[PDB]
Amino acid sequence: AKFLKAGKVAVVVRGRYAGKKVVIVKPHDEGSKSHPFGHALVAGIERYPLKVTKKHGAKKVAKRTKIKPFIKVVNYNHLLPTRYTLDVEAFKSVVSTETFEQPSQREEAKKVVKKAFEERHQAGKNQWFFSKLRF
Amino acid sequence: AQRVTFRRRNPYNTRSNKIKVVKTPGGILRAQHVKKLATRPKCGDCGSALQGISTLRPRQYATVSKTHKTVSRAYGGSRCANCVKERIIRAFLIEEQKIVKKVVKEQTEAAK
Amino acid sequence: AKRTKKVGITGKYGVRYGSSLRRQVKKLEIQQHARYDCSFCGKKTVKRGAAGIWTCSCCKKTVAGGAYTVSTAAAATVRSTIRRLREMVEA
Amino acid sequence: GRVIRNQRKGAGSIFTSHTRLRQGAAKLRTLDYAERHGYIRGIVKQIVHDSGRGAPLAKVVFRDPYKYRLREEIFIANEGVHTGQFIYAGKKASLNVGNVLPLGSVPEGTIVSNVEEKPGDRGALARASGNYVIIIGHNPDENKTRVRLPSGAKKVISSDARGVIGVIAGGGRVDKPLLKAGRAFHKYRLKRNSWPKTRGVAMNPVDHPHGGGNHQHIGKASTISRGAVSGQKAGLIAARRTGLLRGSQKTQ
Amino acid sequence: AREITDIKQFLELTRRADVKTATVKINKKLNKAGKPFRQTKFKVRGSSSLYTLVINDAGKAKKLIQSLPPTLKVNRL
RNA sequence: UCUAAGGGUCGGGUACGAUCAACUUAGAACUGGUACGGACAAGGGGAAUCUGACUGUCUAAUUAAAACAUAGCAUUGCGAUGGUCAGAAAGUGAUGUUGACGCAAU
RNA sequence: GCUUGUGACGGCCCGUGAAAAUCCACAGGAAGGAAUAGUUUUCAUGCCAGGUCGUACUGAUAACCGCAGCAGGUCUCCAAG
RNA sequence: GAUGGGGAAGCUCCGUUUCAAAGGCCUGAUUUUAUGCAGGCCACCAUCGAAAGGGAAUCCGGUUAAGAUUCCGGAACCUGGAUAUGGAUUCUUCACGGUAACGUAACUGAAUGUGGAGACGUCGGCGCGAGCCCUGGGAGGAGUUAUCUUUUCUUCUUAAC
Ligand SMILES: [Mg+2]
Ligand SMILES: [Mg+2]
Ligand SMILES: [Mg+2]
Ligand SMILES: [Mg+2]
Ligand SMILES: [Mg+2]
Ligand SMILES: [Mg+2]
Ligand SMILES: [Mg+2]
Ligand SMILES: [Mg+2]
Ligand SMILES: [Mg+2]
Ligand SMILES: [Mg+2]
Ligand SMILES: [Mg+2]
Ligand SMILES: [Mg+2]
Ligand SMILES: [Mg+2]
Ligand SMILES: [Mg+2]
Ligand SMILES: [Mg+2]
Ligand SMILES: [Mg+2]
Ligand SMILES: [Mg+2]
Ligand SMILES: [Mg+2]
Ligand SMILES: [Mg+2]
Ligand SMILES: [Mg+2]
Ligand SMILES: [Mg+2]
Ligand SMILES: [Mg+2]
Ligand SMILES: [Mg+2]
Ligand SMILES: [Mg+2]
Ligand SMILES: [Mg+2]
Ligand SMILES: [Mg+2]
Ligand SMILES: [Mg+2]
Ligand SMILES: [Mg+2]
Ligand SMILES: [Mg+2]
Ligand SMILES: [Mg+2]
Ligand SMILES: [Mg+2]
Ligand SMILES: [Mg+2]
Ligand SMILES: [Mg+2]
Ligand SMILES: [Mg+2]
Ligand SMILES: [Mg+2]
Ligand SMILES: [Mg+2]
Ligand SMILES: [Mg+2]
Ligand SMILES: [Mg+2]
Ligand SMILES: [Mg+2]
Ligand SMILES: [Mg+2]
Ligand SMILES: [Mg+2]
Ligand SMILES: [Mg+2]
Ligand SMILES: [Mg+2]
Ligand SMILES: [Mg+2]
Ligand SMILES: [Mg+2]
Ligand SMILES: [Mg+2]
Ligand SMILES: [Mg+2]
Ligand SMILES: [Mg+2]
Ligand SMILES: [Mg+2]
Ligand SMILES: [Mg+2]
Ligand SMILES: [Zn+2]
């Protein structure tokens, strides 16, 4: 398909967030006045849930499962499109163009997507999306 | 006209006895010894002098903040970015093809 | 402006050592200094780098091979024989 | 009478090897579990020149099956093995150039190098730039394999003895005339103190069995007995024939 | 070793605990191409670095000089 | 004492101009007790015979050679429980970080 | 221009032209750590301390070796019109 | 070149990681107390050997009858050690920003692994730096001036950091 659409998972492949996984939430398939290139607005996972085990109890579990999210505008030539896919309805509104520009907007955004991603991790939905790609 | 002398006792032209001439506020020439040059650290992966990373003699790296010794992204101060791009892709694909060869030979074991 | 009738690179050696010895050397120098086709990336950018070691300008691959040539005729016919023999043991 | 030159070499003084620049000793992996039950993968991470050797070496790295870490062996590079290539070593390994297999596992006519005399001896035969050994056949009960060495000699060894598929790179190094004294000089400058050579016939009697005389000459037969003694053995020792080898050679 | 320009950031230095001495230097210098004027360098000797604040303006100078800590041991010229 | 040739930098809608700075080379006059690489600096050439191919080496202190070495050519030994060599011996040693496109010996 | 330093290149090899201390970085994530207040000294500033032996001069037609203040020998840097 | 060793009548010879039960660190366990054991590693197995190889970090002025990168003056820097104050970070706990190459005053990180640096021939032309050499103007001091020369000589410099 025009396979870069609403809920594709993808691996960022340059710049800090390199090797981390994202979700496409909005695709500007052709240009910006700025961003003179096809580019997606993604919400990704910056600091994954660490592994958890039976030895992990109570709070240490709560601790291990914390997630540091991130959101990014990124050229298509920096995502590997993945065969996998995760739903992005909880934060359609959260990740806007207007969400970038002015930092506080981005912080609240990530706040949601942080609560959004952690809900999703318990009751292991998209289990793959919650495990560091190793390289 | 004006000439000049070594400053350490060693009289010979060895690498560690590079000299360099210089005019002082006295208005006279004097030698000054010049430490052997830094060489740029190299991507231990492709081998290129790796970018964003300041270049010193090795002990002098302990005298400098970490932002002179990395670039942000994973395998920062260590490999050459384009090298990491490769890492990322190859890792992904191979881990995937891994799964495809599983369920293909998993099918075979049941189809024979 | 064709520069010498025949001694080619062997000109450096002047009159010394005697024709035959120089003939022989010209053959194998012309072999080693020559630039070769890279099997891996397709560009002719394989020059030699010490006896037996053939590496590639761009794409930086190094292949072990003949002392003055990339592929020695011997190894070639080996390659084929290992082909042939391997064939047998999967079919 | 003086001690002659070939005797002086044994005490190893100026005569020892010129070893500083050498990459390491080349050897096959140690003969561990993996290599004699399955196979184990490596990668040639670099092929590289060994000083005073005529064939390139191949650094090939493997995992420690027992510890988390890399262990890097030093191989002699066969021809056409290349950087980044995958290298397979083991009983149950595959038959391509570059890999290393017990001679039991290769059909007759295989061509292999750096082959062990005994198993786990980490390579002994056909190691010089150019050479190889050829399998001429196996005998399964009391398991052996027969090979023809570079010498032409047939010899039979244990079929568990490992070999590496192909011939050794740098073939034909000896085709190019050395041309001037210097090349020979620099050749040996990285081998040993074996050059240049004075003819015994140019020496005095203290110096040699060939020494002296008012014309230069050997004076007696220069074929010397096997049972000769140190200081006697100069010339053609044990020679069973002598003179221009008329006729085709090649082991019948 | 260090030169300074934020005229407040300097003021803070002049009271920075370890600062016992200071020195004020005055230099005749020229302007653009024609006339001359009066450069004045404010030098606070820190324990590890010697800071010097050039005030180009003669007016800014005088008023700055009075503000100098009334405990600070300043060497004039 | 003249002459010609060989360069640099700027602004030109989307042909030229202006100046700055270099010894090279060739040509042309004039001129002298015909001298002028004016000191310094700086290869004699040619025709052959003998002999070693060459460059390189040695008798410090009577021999530098045609003698030694050399590349090149040819012969020998050896697959490691080995060849050649060292040691009084040895759980000793050189070649050997070596393997016949090798090492050893003429 | 001269001398020296350095760079991007090119030529050469049957010659492809040390080692180790030492310093840094990365992968890893064991652990540890906040809202009534935590974590942080690879940011800045601030405090103390750095022992032992050698340091003169000659380095040569007189300071060294040649019986000697011997026309010999004896490693090297700087270099004007 | 000592050591477990092996030879040797013996002075000694061999061997140097070699047929060896070869060792020490990080902190926890102590709140009888100073340091026993609890983990978990690390098996690298002496040492001597460079005043030209490697290598933490200093400069300029001044000063002596004779010392100076060593004294004096001024200004630095490195290493070990202590440590607080400011800043940064955190209610989304372990920084943001840039599509990206990457940015930064900071922006936790044990074992273990891995990478870089230390670290490397020789010649050739090209390119660039420094010091030197040449030179115009001006500001000085000097020399020649029968005659001629807006002249001949000279000063005009800037360290580490
Ligand atoms: Mg991390
Ligand atoms: Mg002058
Ligand atoms: Mg001195
Ligand atoms: Mg040099
Ligand atoms: Mg930087
Ligand atoms: Mg950086
Ligand atoms: Mg040796
Ligand atoms: Mg010799
Ligand atoms: Mg000979
Ligand atoms: Mg000879
Ligand atoms: Mg003689
Ligand atoms: Mg005899
Ligand atoms: Mg005799
Ligand atoms: Mg004789
Ligand atoms: Mg004869
Ligand atoms: Mg002109
Ligand atoms: Mg004419
Ligand atoms: Mg001759
Ligand atoms: Mg000669
Ligand atoms: Mg003589
Ligand atoms: Mg005599
Ligand atoms: Mg002569
Ligand atoms: Mg003579
Ligand atoms: Mg001769
Ligand atoms: Mg002949
Ligand atoms: Mg014994
Ligand atoms: Mg010189
Ligand atoms: Mg090279
Ligand atoms: Mg580094
Ligand atoms: Mg634990
Ligand atoms: Mg600090
Ligand atoms: Mg102490
Ligand atoms: Mg002195
Ligand atoms: Mg004297
Ligand atoms: Mg004398
Ligand atoms: Mg001993
Ligand atoms: Mg020592
Ligand atoms: Mg030293
Ligand atoms: Mg030194
Ligand atoms: Mg001084
Ligand atoms: Mg004094
Ligand atoms: Mg003095
Ligand atoms: Mg002082
Ligand atoms: Mg001070
Ligand atoms: Mg400190
Ligand atoms: Mg910040
Ligand atoms: Mg390392
Ligand atoms: Mg390295
Ligand atoms: Mg070195
Ligand atoms: Mg300095
Ligand atoms: Zn290629």
Q: Give B8 Cα–ligand 32 centroid separation in angstroms.
A: 27
Q: If you count them, how many residues does chain E have? A: 77
Under a CB-based contact definition with an 8 Å cutoff, are residues C25 and C31 in contact? no
As given in the structure block, the two tokens for residue D8 are: 């002086």
CB-side neighbour CA atoms (13 Å) of D208: 21
Method: X-ray
Show residues of chain B in contact with A14, CB under 8 Å.
73, 81, 85
- Classify the phi-psi angles of E10: left when phi > 0, otherwise alpha if psi is within -120 to 50, otherwise beta: alpha
Which of B84, E44, E40 is CA-nearest to residue A17?
B84
Core vs surface per residue D116-128: b (16+ CB within 10 A) or e: beebebbbebbbb
**Cβ of B10 less than 7 A from strand G:** no
Q: Output the DSSP codes for C21-88.
A: HHHHHHHHHHHHHS-EE-TTT-SEEEEE-STTEEEETTT--EEE--SSSSS-HHHHHHHHHHHHHHHH
Q: Which residue has the tokens 């596992």?
A: D105
Taking CB atoms and an 8 Å limit, are B72 and A11 in contact across chains? no
* Contact: chain E with chain C (3+ CB pairs below 8 Å): no
**Residues ≥6 apart with Cβ < 8 Å to B103:** none
Shortest-distance nucleotide from A34 CA to C1': H99
Pairing relationship of beta strands D236-237 and E2-4 according to DSSP bridges? unpaired
Residue A77: other Cβ atoms inside 10 A: 10
Rounded to whole angstroms, the Cα distance separating A56 from A78 reads 36
* D186 contact C CB<8A: no
Q: Which residue has the tokens 């300041």?
A: B54
Helix ranges, A5-127 (H): 58-64, 103-121
Under a CB-based contact definition with an 8 Å cutoff, are residues B104 and B111 in contact? no
Signed CA dihedral, E1, E5, E9, E10: sign only:
positive
* Contact: chain B with chain A (3+ CB pairs below 8 Å): yes
Rounded to whole angstroms, the Cα distance separating B22 from E51 reads 27
Taking CB atoms and an 8 Å limit, are C28 and D82 in contact across chains? no
Resolution of this deposited model, Å: 3.2
As given in the structure block, the two tokens for residue B5 are: 């002398």
* Longest Cα separation, chain A: 53
Peptide bond into D196 cis (omega under 30): yes
Q: Output the DSSP codes for D2-52.
A: PPPHHHHGGG-SSSSB--TT------PPP--GGGGTSEEEEEEEEEEEPTT
CA distances from D102 to D88, D116, D171 (A): 12, 9, 24
Rounded to whole angstroms, the Cα distance separating D1 from D198 reads 18
**Cβ of B6 less than 7 A from strand G:** yes
Amino acid (one-letter) located at C54: W
D neighbour chains, 3+ CB pairs within 8 Å: C
Q: CA E4 – C1' H68 distance (Å)?
A: 36
* Longest Cα separation, chain C: 60
Rounded to whole angstroms, the Cα distance separating A24 from A87 reads 10
Nearest-5° angle of CA A49, CA A53, CA A54? 145
3-state secondary structure of A17: coil
Q: Output the DSSP codes for B32-95.
A: -B-PPPP---B-TTT-PBPTT-----GGGGGGS-GGGS--SSSSTTTS-SHHHHHHHHHHHHHH
Residue A43: other Cβ atoms inside 10 A: 27
Q: If you count them, how many residues does chain B have? A: 112
Nearest-CA distance D230 → chain C (Å): 38
Q: Which residue has the tokens 């520069």?
A: C3
Rounded to whole angstroms, the Cα distance separating A127 from A51 reads 12
**Residues ≥6 apart with Cβ < 8 Å to E22:** E14, E42, E43, E44, E45, E68, E72, E73, E74, E75
Nearest-CA distance D201 → chain C (Å): 26
Strand order in the sheet with A21-28: A68-75, A39-47, A21-28, A8-12, A79-85
Show residues of chain A in contact with B73, CB under 8 Å.
14-16, 18
Signed CA dihedral, D114, D120, D122, D124: sign only:
negative
**Residues ≥6 apart with Cβ < 8 Å to A59:** none
Amino acid (one-letter) located at D82: H
Which of B51, B58, B78, B53 is CA-nearest to residue B68?
B53
* D17 contact C CB<8A: no
Which of D238, D233, D227, D228 is CA-nearest to residue D209?
D233
CB-side neighbour CA atoms (13 Å) of D215: 2
* Residue to substitute from D79, D83, D85, D110, interface C, most C β-carbons within 10 A: D79
CA distances from D119 to D41, D115, D162 (A): 20, 9, 6
Under a CB-based contact definition with an 8 Å cutoff, are residues E13 and E65 in contact? no
Under a CB-based contact definition with an 8 Å cutoff, are residues C54 and C36 in contact? yes
